[PDB]
Design a protein around this ligand. Structure first.
Ligand SMILES: O=C(NCCCCCCCNC(=O)NS(=O)(=O)c1cccc(Cl)c1)NS(=O)(=O)c1cccc(Cl)c1
Ligand SMILES: O=C(NCCCCCCCNC(=O)NS(=O)(=O)c1cccc(Cl)c1)NS(=O)(=O)c1cccc(Cl)c1
Lengths: 318, 317, 319, 317
């Protein structure tokens, strides 16, 4: 039978005997994603070009902020767009903390590269007044995470304790349709994904690993390379086709480049739920304990046999 | 003033004192692109999944049916069809169109940007229409372009007047002119190829890429981007400058992209925007085709970058 | 704060401390309505006309509602204009609710692009018996929720429950129903009357007299304007919004009127009443008719309370 | 083969050896209409209600702006505007357009069908354009028609070649030709007028209606329909046959509907579809207006319904 995001969420919610506050959050977010999608695909751009006589990142942020606030399910919202945590007004406060990138990859949307919305959802743990500290939970504490991808089609990928599920937005009806259920990543893939433009900056572990992928020691076939440069796009591919995605530390980004709270954690959560792995090189992404909301981490994620092969190499270089 | 594709093509025709046949072709094409765009973004997918109780083929059928019915074509060459399609006598116009109705669709299961690529020729002889009519060098192109189905859907159309970019507004289904007479940066900061296959690289390609990552001087190393969808990679090259490479090697001495409906259209866009497109040995546009599906090596982008490639290429020749 | 139908229903449910089953029902029904709207506005019509080289809309509409409602896990008995007998939801899918609906009301004339619509009325199964056709035979008083989707110049969902009447505009850019008119009430007295006057020769002498009062007021007031779209959902919606009176009365040729009680008259009666309006057969409240056949007809006179009362006065004067 | 408004029009223009200017006009109108439809169906309404924290006026702006930049017009008359608009010299073309950008919008509050009405004239004179160029009998129309935003959006376009109906497919933003060379029923079974004005009716209209409810030849009484939006009523009249009436009353002694951009275009469509359109005294299209907003009575529809009305009229003088 046809399943929709709204039906699905509600039925997982009813099974879990919940009060429906996460559903309202998830419903509000779905609504925001469909609105983001519509702007991203440029509906109404004719009016901007004078048919009758905000920047996308800013609008997408406003969509997500306003929908989550008005859901009555959140208290603290961290956004790539906002310098400090946003604290929901008392009258609209609920139990959840949400970290999100409202339009990841947007820096290069001028070229119509896939962009995405990434989100991670935590239960507020502290009984203190809500503040920025509430979003400084390790990703292991994630209740649910995921992303919407505005690629050739729009897709929302939702990860919960019950698994990873993939919904396609049908823009003729503004409905997310369940198309891939309880999704698992391939044990081993055949694609590696990273900016090799930073080759001069790589630590020897990354350098050796990539040399293994191009000139395999067992004389198997070399891995293919893909690198969109938009994280949602690369991670989705990695989930769908298997393989490995990398954004290691470099001289410009000595703590890595991607943001822990709202890029690494949500993706690592989706990966782990689908049977994959995500590591900083020293430790599972999900184990890192944040100290700063916009702090960065290095990340290697994807198929378990690929990440493990990377960590055998990492261990080799100590 | 607001400018749409329908308006744009029609005013160019009137300048050129044309009959409207190219305009009828381009309108039909653009109609096909809106339809492919609607299907790629998955409108109606709820019905497939039972709310009430292929894509590359559809895209092919759309382009093929709109073009035939435009009354402006006589010979249609598609990546999807083994032979050239000869238009029925009653529907024959003067143009020969080569196209890839959905480029990059091999990986569409991961929602990668995809595209439609097309190149339009004037039929050069009065012989009965046949595949030979599509075997013209890229130099002979009348119009070429691509539709990119990315974050948004954009039509890039190159003609003698230059390269013009039109954004699809799905709310009304109009291609709105958003970037006029566009030109590529003289030199970029990005390189684009599949490095996974480095061991099969031609020596020249190895050296050039090495130099992009490890510059001899004080310059920054280039960034690397590779979508694996030609339309997406070329359009980024257009917007940001740089270089896109699908070069020849020993196991593929004519490369892998198809000349008629991938390489040539993109090479024509690049040249009209002030870029270059080479096989290593000659401009892609000067290759005289002998087979409609023949392969061609392609290296394109900012002129400084493509010339630096040719410097390294020739070093190894 | 912005309010979408999904959000609205959810917050009513929590104020009623409900299990969520009627929300699932309504959620499902809104999905079907967006799909009906999309089909009605002729999305994809280019494919029928050979752009790349089939069901009638009322059939597609029935298929959509039936299917979304069955899969909501919230229904047990479904009556639709399309089907001779009640549909009994399969055991694995059963829920507590009974739905009577008209999937694409007015679609006979759809060829002229007339406004069409979907009407629905929801009940709780009363009996402990196995679900059957009997469970649909409740008087409209027993309605939990009712309403319609109007596919007109825009698509609107009017929902009426105990809390009153709320109107939700469908934003087709994003597939959301946005609450635009809240706790809606009809005018005490309107200035338009609505019926097929072309069949005047068969009119009830009471209806004849009333329409004459409207066209030739005995009292120096301005005569009413007439509007009759010919599509119940459009006329009833205009009745709610501008006030006035809509008629489909019983005559000699048709002692029980023409519209169907369970999935046409009842829901509009229920919406009218929750908006402070009235709906009568001429003899009783439409909502008070205890039905004995799921496809039985009932006369209907509805709209602003003063207008309906004035009709009743005339009607009772002819006994 | 599939046909689009874009393609249909361009192909009529080529058969006529036209210079393309009317095509540019109609393409522009086409675009304006899709943008009106998107607005009417309430796309974007969520942004009005705070999702991220006038309809008649927008419609007018869309038609006015699109027509001006079409380079094809010189005098624009609108229901929305007191005086005729004179297109500036640089955007000036040879056509006059009179239009109602959102007919029936005074009750759009209840989501009644609304529509756009247009009629197009050629300016012959070498005079500087002026309001009075719009003062022409409908007989002089080059093209006319309407777009109806009902359950679906349909453009009806009437030209010398006949009447052609185009459904807007909003999936792709394209007008698809669905009904070719349309001809109205010889006689219908629906009459359409506001019977709330019966106290005011001329005895000729009273009698005619009486004939509808009580047929003298013992045929079946007609049904009555009255949306109250002219485009919806007239369109149902084109599709199902019958008769439409807005005659003179007390509040509107010269009729209520506007000759130049309600009556004339509907009359012209009706006549091109083999129907009729009469003030009672003469053909609508034969009226010579002296005021761009002048009112006219209109009785239109199936020819045998119109003659039966006129038969009754000619009896009461
Ligand atoms: O979703 C969850 N439980 C189900 C939702 C229960 C709360 C929302 C519905 C409120 N109640 C009604 O609507 N009642 S009614 O329908 O009878 C009604 C009554 C009167 C009027 C109307 Cl219109 C309706 N829990 S969770 O969100 O914590 C969750 C936990 C785990 C995983 C996920 Cl994804 C989610
Ligand atoms: O576009 C081109 N020429 C201008 C086309 C416009 C004029 C001729 C169009 C057909 N005639 C009409 O429509 N006449 S009408 O409007 O009076 C009319 C008359 C009766 C009915 C109706 Cl509805 C209309 N040439 S091109 O295609 O070779 C080209 C060349 C170079 C670059 C490009 Cl992109 C294109």
């Amino acid at each position: 039978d046809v399943n929709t995001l709204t039906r699905f969420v509600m039925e997982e919610g009813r099974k879990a005997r919940g009060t429906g506050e996460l559903t309202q959050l998830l419903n509000s977010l779905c609504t925001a994603v469909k609105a983001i999608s519509s702007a991203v695909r440029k509906a109404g751009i004719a009016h901007l070009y004078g048919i009758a006589g905000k920047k996308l990142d800013v609008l997408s942020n406003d969509l997500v902020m306003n929908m989550l606030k008005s859901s009555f399910a959140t208290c603290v919202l961290v956004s790539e767009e906002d310098k400090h945590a946003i604290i929901v007004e008392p009258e609209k406060r609920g139990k959840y903390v949400v970290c999100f990138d409202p339009l990841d990859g947007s820096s290069n949307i001028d070229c119509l590269v896939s962009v995405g919305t990434i989100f991670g959802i935590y239960r507020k743990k502290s009984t203190d007044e809500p503040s920025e500290k509430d979003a400084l939970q390790p990703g292991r504490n994630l209740v649910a995470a995921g992303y919407a991808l505005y690629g050739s089609a729009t897709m929302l990928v939702l990860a919960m304790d019950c698994g990873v599920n993939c919904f396609m937005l049908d823009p003729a009806i503004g409905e997310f349709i369940l198309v891939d259920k309880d999704v698992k990543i391939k044990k081993k893939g055949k694609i590696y994904s990273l900016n090799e433009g930073y080759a001069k900056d790589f630590d020897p572990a990354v350098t050796e690993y990539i040399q293994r992928k191009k000139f395999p020691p067992d004389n198997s076939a070399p891995y293919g390379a893909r690198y969109v440069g938009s994280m949602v796009a690369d991670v989705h591919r990695t989930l769908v086709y298997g393989g490995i995605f990398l954004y290691p530390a470099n001289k410009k980004s000595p703590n890595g480049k991607l943001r822990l709270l709202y890029e690494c954690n949500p993706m690592a959560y989706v990966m782990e739920k689908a049977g994959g792995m995500a590591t900083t090189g020293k430790e599972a992404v999900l184990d890192v304990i944040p100290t700063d909301i916009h702090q960065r981490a290095p990340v290697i994620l994807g198929s378990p046999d690929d990440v493990l092969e990377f960590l055998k190499v990492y261990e080799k270089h100590s």
